[PDB]
Amino acid sequence: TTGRIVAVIGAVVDVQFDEGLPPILNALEVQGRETRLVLEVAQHLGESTVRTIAMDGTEGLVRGQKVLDSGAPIRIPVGPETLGRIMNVIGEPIDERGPIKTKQFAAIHAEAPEFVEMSVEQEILVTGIKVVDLLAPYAKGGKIGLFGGAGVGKTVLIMELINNVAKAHGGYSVFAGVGERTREGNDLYHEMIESGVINLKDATSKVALVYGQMNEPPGARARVALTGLTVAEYFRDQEGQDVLLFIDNIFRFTQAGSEVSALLGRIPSAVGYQPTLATDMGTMQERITTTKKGSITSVQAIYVPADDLTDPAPATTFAHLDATTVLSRAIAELGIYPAVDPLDSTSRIMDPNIVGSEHYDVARGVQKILQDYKSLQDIIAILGMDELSEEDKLTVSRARKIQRFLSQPFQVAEVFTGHLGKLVPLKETIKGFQQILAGEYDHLPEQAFYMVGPIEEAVAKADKLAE
Amino acid sequence: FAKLVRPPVQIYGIEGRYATALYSAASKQNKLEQVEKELLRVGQILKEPKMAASLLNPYVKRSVKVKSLSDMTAKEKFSPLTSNLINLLAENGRLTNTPAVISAFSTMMSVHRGEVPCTVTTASALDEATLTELKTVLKSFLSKGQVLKLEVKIDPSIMGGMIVRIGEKYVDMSAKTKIQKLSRAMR
Amino acid sequence: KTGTAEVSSILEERILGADTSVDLEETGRVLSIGDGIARVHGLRNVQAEEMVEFSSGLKGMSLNLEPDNVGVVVFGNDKLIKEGDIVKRTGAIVDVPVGEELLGRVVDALGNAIDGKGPIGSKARRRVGLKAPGIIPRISVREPMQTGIKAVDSLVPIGRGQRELIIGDRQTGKTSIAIDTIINQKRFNDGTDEKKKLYCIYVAIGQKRSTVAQLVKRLTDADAMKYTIVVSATASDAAPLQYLAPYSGCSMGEYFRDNGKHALIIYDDLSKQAVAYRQMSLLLRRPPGREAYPGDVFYLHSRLLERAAKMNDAFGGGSLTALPVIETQAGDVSAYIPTNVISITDGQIFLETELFYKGIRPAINVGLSVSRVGSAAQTRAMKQVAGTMKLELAQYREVAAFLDAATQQLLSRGVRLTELLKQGQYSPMAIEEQVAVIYAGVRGYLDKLEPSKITKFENAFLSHVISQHQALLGKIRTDGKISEESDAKLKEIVTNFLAGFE
Amino acid sequence: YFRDNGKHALIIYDDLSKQAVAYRQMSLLLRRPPGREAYPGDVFYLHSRLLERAAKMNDAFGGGSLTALPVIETQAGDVSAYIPTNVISITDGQIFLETELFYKGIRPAINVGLSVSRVGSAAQTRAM
Ligand SMILES: Nc1ncnc2c1ncn2[C@@H]1O[C@H](COP(=O)(O)OP(=O)(O)OP(=O)(O)O)[C@@H](O)[C@H]1O
Ligand SMILES: Nc1ncnc2c1ncn2[C@@H]1O[C@H](COP(=O)(O)OP(=O)(O)O)[C@@H](O)[C@H]1O
Ligand SMILES: [Mg+2]
Structure with a gap:
């Protein structure tokens, strides 16, 4: 069916079909362009006319051009051949490597898993990172949230999570770049090519990048997280495996939604956000869950505008987060990498009903000792080490040892430190910390633990540097 | 809803919607020409002082106006389409702009039979042999079948030459614009 | 101005009299679905807040009975609704x-x-x-x-x-x-x-x-x-x-x-x-x-x-x-x-x-x-206990802003009571055990326990009374109030258990 | 350009x-x-x-x-x-x-x- 354009108001087109309208969310191809312009219906205005939001620049459109209705919502290729590729919102590769030859196609607008599908057991995703898997465990099919700014090792942590999940759980990953600066998009592409998660030679890549640039019209920055979700839903459903999904950033998702809502004329809500803020976030955060076929974990970067944790966007996101990972700069000066802060990083599953009593007691002990050391830090700074008894200096020594032991050498970060990547399993982390707390290693120099994997390697390092 | 046949030209607003509805309904049943005849008739029938006075007062109950229109449309013996349209306009309260409707419909029928508007604004008075050559040359712009409806206009306000409009296509060879163009170029 | 049922697709039906064929007293056609609301044309016999049913199996309710077209909120995703779909009453x-x-x-x-x-x-x-x-x-x-x-x-x-x-x-x-x-x-x-x-x-x-x-x-x-x-x-x-x-x-x-x-x-x-x-x-x-x-x-x-x-x-x-x-x-x-x-x-x-x-x-x-x-x-037992527990906590909350032994005593009492009031999760306790523990707390018997140890005492205590003294709890529940003899019992049981806890 | x-x-x-x-x-x-x-x-x-x-x-x-x-x-x-x-x-x-x-x-x-x-x-620059 072929309709005709009848209005082009900014980035909102209005098409006048006659024979039969397309149901909302169908993708229409605008005939007569050279770059593929794709509109997406958003309303029916009566009189066989539909108000479509355009997914690309709408300069040069002529009242009367022919718009051909595809039939189903925006469709993308979702095979395993979408791995190591970059593709914009509509599924067209932008890596200048050719077509994404796949036999499957998936619509980006698919409803969330039904209630029967949902899995009722809250598991724990073993990331292989000591601090993360100990104090702020990541949950399968849980929406983690990664705070912290730039310069603190966020891209490195993303690449490490990708690599560790690809090795341990044998599950691929995705990266939906909502509103992703073009410069940083290129830098991330080349960082992955370096670290080796993407591989241009053999088709053994572990990431399926997806970029909705920061300059693409607002209607095509809201529907990029959905593209990532579909590429990952293929791996969960059609291959039954765990998956990651990084949405950098998840404030620009709400920003794009707000701009689209304003364009469609809808009254703005509380703080200028769209009236459908909560449901727009829900119908996208509700496909990130653990069904019985597989699971889609998700590590979503969060920007908190003006440090307002009440602001409707970071207040609507936090209603879904199942974790947190507050990368901090103050912990990067010490060199403890990853910079993950241990006292801010929350997690909803850090409860002895889920992780287990041993895990919970160990993690709570680590938190308490670190809090006590942070407090004694003030007394030492003000008055001096003399002011403390040994009942406190022992906790100080243990706390310094723990702060050291939380640092880990990532595999992708070999270029920086040279050390080898250590994928310490969960049990080894638990034993190491349970023992460092039991005083069993109060004599080894702190630098025994700095940048090691298990505790046994810390013992070996102490022996080496002690001779 | 039921498929409807679009007009050749699009008119917009209230009159646009009503004229489009009437034209599509008339194309079915093929009553276009007699529909236009009846539209012209209602044109005058809605200009008699009593009718044009009772169809402006808003204190005449709506049903009263509808019934008076029905009675008048029995005497004039209109087609079912035109009587239904007059009724429709009556009870929607939009009869105050009936002249807008029919006028639009005329523009909808003119293009249907293919009589493209034209116009020739002249520097001053014009001969009629010159008008003959003008028509015979403008017919060179139409498509195969169209007809020319040229409305000449005298204009001494321009300096020389002429301004020719054909549908939209607008060709300006008046000496006035040449003078301002030259002054612009050499300034 | 303009109208919402003044569309061509409707004026055409009305001009050539075709509306005699399609029912409008019991069935409408969605004029326009958008923003989660459907302007529907027809349904002349629809009651306000009736529950109409669309042609996709969806269901909505009619909010606005505007003179020319109903307005219907769709209980679902309007993705499934298209202008022109047929909406049927349900008369309920x-x-x-x-x-x-x-x-x-x-x-x-x-x-x-x-x-x-x-x-x-x-x-x-x-x-x-x-x-x-x-x-x-x-x-x-x-x-x-x-x-x-x-x-x-x-x-x-x-x-x-x-x-x-x-x-x-x-x-x-x-x-x-x-x-x-x-x-x-x-x-x-x-x-x-x-x-x-x-x-x-x-x-x-x-x-x-x-x-x-x-x-x-x-x-x-x-x-x-x-x-x-x-x-x-x-x-x-x-x-x-x-x-x-x-x-x-x-x-x-x-x-x-x-x-x-x-x-x-x-x-x-x-x-x-x-x-x-x-x-x-x-x-x-x-x-x-x-x-x-x-x-x-x-x-x-x-x-x-x-x-x-x-x-x-x-x-x-x-x-x-x-x-x-x-x-x-x-x-x-x-x-x-x-x-x-x-x-x-x-x-x-x-x-x-x-x-x-x-x-x-x-x-x-x-x-x-x-x-x-x-x-x-x-329950009057819980009243006999709360009437004093609330008082003790109220006194404690004043002396929580800062001593002579009076305020030290009040602080000790408050800390003991709050430490009692903690609780696990998905582990609700019948009212009889509540009165037992809250009584053993308010009546001072836990004044001689290190604060952190109450968190354990309670646990153990429950077991010791859930087995040995079913009869006492039964009497408390059935009578609903701590009878003076029941008070004497509870007192001697708490004393005996406290004797050798450590 | x-x-x-x-x-x-x-x-x-x-x-x-x-x-x-x-x-x-x-x-x-x-x-x-x-x-x-x-x-x-x-x-x-x-x-x-x-x-x-x-x-x-x-x-x-x-x-x-x-x-x-x-x-x-x-x-x-x-x-x-x-x-x-x-x-x-x-x-x-x-x-x-x-x-x-x-x-x-x-x-x-x-x-x-x-x-x-x-x-x-x-x-x-390496100097700066
Ligand atoms: N009495 C309790 N003892 C120990 N832990 C608790 C207790 N109550 C709640 N929690 C813990 O607090 C966390 C959040 O609790 P809860 O599910 O009540 O959140 P909430 O208050 O409902 O807010 P939300 O609506 O976000 O869930 C859970 O991990 C739960 O285990
Ligand atoms: N495991 C690590 N070991 C040593 N240095 C690290 C580690 N992780 C991050 N860094 C340092 O932090 C910096 C992070 O930069 P990059 O990841 O490119 O962007 P961002 O600063 O936003 O994370 C790197 O330049 C690196 O020197
Ligand atoms: Mg809750």
Whole structure:
């Protein structure tokens, strides 16, 4: 069916079909362009006319051009051949490597898993990172949230999570770049090519990048997280495996939604956000869950505008987060990498009903000792080490040892430190910390633990540097 | 809803919607020409002082106006389409702009039979042999079948030459614009 | 100006008289679906708030009966609706199935089971847009609704028919209190006396569907599902469903209230209903107000929380408690909605977040938590104990701002009591064990225990009395009050147990 | 033109918070729906599709370049207003200027605490 354009108001087109309208969310191809312009219906205005939001620049459109209705919502290729590729919102590769030859196609607008599908057991995703898997465990099919700014090792942590999940759980990953600066998009592409998660030679890549640039019209920055979700839903459903999904950033998702809502004329809500803020976030955060076929974990970067944790966007996101990972700069000066802060990083599953009593007691002990050391830090700074008894200096020594032991050498970060990547399993982390707390290693120099994997390697390092 | 046949030209607003509805309904049943005849008739029938006075007062109950229109449309013996349209306009309260409707419909029928508007604004008075050559040359712009409806206009306000409009296509060879163009170029 | 039924596709039908063929008194055609509302043309015989059914199997209700075209809110995703679709009446104000054929089922906001266990084979359909009981049917709140939580039962007692309010910042222990209250009714629901059995309803509004699934699994893990309904309009569900969910639940509960039985409905949570309603309004162009909430976001809750009444013997003696949950923002209990709901309910339960960080779980903040009506409805044993526990904590809270041995004594008492008031999770204790432990605490016997050790004492104590002294607890429960001889016993048992605890 | 002709350019918009105002007028008069602070919904697309032309082409497309130094005026250090945050989330840095520093005598009044550059160590000579 072929309709005709009848209005082009900014980035909102209005098409006048006659024979039969397309149901909302169908993708229409605008005939007569050279770059593929794709509109997406958003309303029916009566009189066989539909108000479509355009997914690309709408300069040069002529009242009367022919718009051909595809039939189903925006469709993308979702095979395993979408791995190591970059593709914009509509599924067209932008890596200048050719077509994404796949036999499957998936619509980006698919409803969330039904209630029967949902899995009722809250598991724990073993990331292989000591601090993360100990104090702020990541949950399968849980929406983690990664705070912290730039310069603190966020891209490195993303690449490490990708690599560790690809090795341990044998599950691929995705990266939906909502509103992703073009410069940083290129830098991330080349960082992955370096670290080796993407591989241009053999088709053994572990990431399926997806970029909705920061300059693409607002209607095509809201529907990029959905593209990532579909590429990952293929791996969960059609291959039954765990998956990651990084949405950098998840404030620009709400920003794009707000701009689209304003364009469609809808009254703005509380703080200028769209009236459908909560449901727009829900119908996208509700496909990130653990069904019985597989699971889609998700590590979503969060920007908190003006440090307002009440602001409707970071207040609507936090209603879904199942974790947190507050990368901090103050912990990067010490060199403890990853910079993950241990006292801010929350997690909803850090409860002895889920992780287990041993895990919970160990993690709570680590938190308490670190809090006590942070407090004694003030007394030492003000008055001096003399002011403390040994009942406190022992906790100080243990706390310094723990702060050291939380640092880990990532595999992708070999270029920086040279050390080898250590994928310490969960049990080894638990034993190491349970023992460092039991005083069993109060004599080894702190630098025994700095940048090691298990505790046994810390013992070996102490022996080496002690001779 | 039921498929409807679009007009050749699009008119917009209230009159646009009503004229489009009437034209599509008339194309079915093929009553276009007699529909236009009846539209012209209602044109005058809605200009008699009593009718044009009772169809402006808003204190005449709506049903009263509808019934008076029905009675008048029995005497004039209109087609079912035109009587239904007059009724429709009556009870929607939009009869105050009936002249807008029919006028639009005329523009909808003119293009249907293919009589493209034209116009020739002249520097001053014009001969009629010159008008003959003008028509015979403008017919060179139409498509195969169209007809020319040229409305000449005298204009001494321009300096020389002429301004020719054909549908939209607008060709300006008046000496006035040449003078301002030259002054612009050499300034 | 212009019209909305003044479209070509309609004026054509009307001009050539074709409308005689298509029914308009009992069937309409969607003029335009957009912004989650459908302008529908026809349906001349549609009653306001009727429940019309689209041609895609969807269902909506007619809000605006504008003179030329109805306006219909679609209970679902309008993705499925297209201009031109045919909408059919149903001749029934929007209503929902009710009965005891729903117990143990999960149903979406409209009564359609979503646990894949077959249709809800019910017979009665009750409206959702009903009125609340008038002035006369009600009487005071007399029976107690045993929460199973030490703090709630001791210091913030809840009656039956009393609208409580679990209000507090997110991730604080609201859903946990609701689940404890829903699991603690298992003991009462395994007898014969209909005067005790309490049937629970849990409405999950704008709440992650994984969370509701885990909640249902956790309930069935404790056979606390044989007597619970779970209405579920989660985050994904279109706003109109999140809007109806509380009314569907409240109607499924009124069915019990009107038939001499006692129910207990937990809205989790009304703030997300209010957000969904604000969306529904702002998409209908209605004017915004304070925080953009419509003017009537108070006649949205009141007409819902006023049905949680306590009928009197004349009408059946039924009941319907209600424990609406509210998620204040950072710390503001003066915002629009927290205040709009604090003035509709008969109580409050403030779950402070600082307390929750400091390990005092449940985080129930006392002093800011009241139950204006629950005092008249409280087992006299728990009254004999609370009458002094509240006093001791009140004295403690004054001396908590800073000593002679008087204030040291008061601090010791307060710390011991608060350390008692902690509790696990999904481990509700019958009222007899509550009176035992709270008595052994208030009467000073725990003054000679290191604060941290109370957290253990309690545990052990329970076991020692759950086995050895069944008879004493039986007497306390049956008599409802600590008889002087029962006091003498409790005293000697606590002394003997304390002797050799260490 | 320079950038894609293998040359190096540098473009300084001054201000951009007046292009945004001009566009707001153009829109409000065309009757397009307004938004926060009355700016339309495009006042991000507006700037973004501008400040994203500042590139550094590779050596196959010429090796050209185009820096960009959009100047923004903030009403009394209100960096949280609409346009300042719209244009702070598009660019790779910010050189914050303050008037407490301008009158203490620290001229140019740059405020190294808030000023950052997200290329950082790179974009300097080994000496510097
Ligand atoms: N009495 C308790 N003892 C120990 N832990 C508790 C207690 N109550 C709640 N928690 C813990 O607090 C965390 C959050 O609790 P809860 O599920 O009540 O959140 P909430 O208050 O309902 O807010 P949300 O709506 O975000 O869930 C859970 O991990 C739970 O285990
Ligand atoms: N495991 C690590 N070991 C040593 N250095 C690290 C580690 N992780 C991050 N870093 C340092 O942090 C910086 C992070 O930069 P990059 O990941 O490119 O962007 P961002 O600073 O936003 O994370 C790197 O330059 C690196 O020197
Ligand atoms: Mg909750």
